């Protein structure tokens, strides 16, 4: 079933549009959302997302990225 993950990415040109675009485009993604006190984190929910392949992809195209959270969906 579904994993919830939170990613801090550096977003200062349009690294905000790039990070969301890249994350949104990844296999198995159900939702991407700007979260955290400063809207500097991306929370991703889905199935079969490799967090490390995703951190790596972001670092390559956008700039710095850091996995900060993994939570399984509680289904009951």
């Amino acid at each position: 079933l579904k994993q919830k993950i939170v990613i801090k990415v550096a977003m200062e040109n349009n690294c905000r549009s790039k990070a969301m675009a890249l994350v949104a485009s990844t296999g198995g993604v159900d939702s991407v959302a700007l979260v955290g006190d400063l809207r500097d984190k991306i929370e991703v929910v889905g199935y079969g997302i490799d967090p490390i392949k995703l951190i790596s992809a972001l670092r390559k195209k956008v700039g710095d990225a850091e996995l900060l959270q993994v939570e399984q969906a509680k289904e009951d």
Binding site: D30, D37, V45, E66, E71, Q72
Partner: protein, 82 residues
């Protein structure tokens, strides 16, 4: 110094097709708020707490326990409606 009754709610997005997480969490270093988000009650998440990954457990009233690195805590709260 830490009083959750005075902490503004975190920014969140509740995915439509998994259950709504019952708890707000709030991360402090030396009683300064660093971030906040949501997590399930009667559950567990893995969280980067400053330098270290922490396994954090939640009970049925959103009390969180975990091995926080010195100076840091993550504290829980029932979201409105749970």
């Amino acid at each position: 110094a830490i009083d959750l009754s005075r902490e503004r709610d975190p920014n969140f997005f509740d995915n439509a097709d998994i259950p709504v997480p019952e708890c707000f969490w709030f991360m402090f270093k030396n009683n300064v708020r660093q971030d906040a988000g949501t997590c399930y009650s009667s559950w567990k998440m893995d969280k980067k707490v400053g330098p270290n990954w922490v396994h954090i457990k939640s009970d049925d009233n959103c009390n969180l326990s975990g091995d926080f690195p010195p100076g840091w805590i993550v504290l829980g709260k029932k979201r409105p409606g749970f």
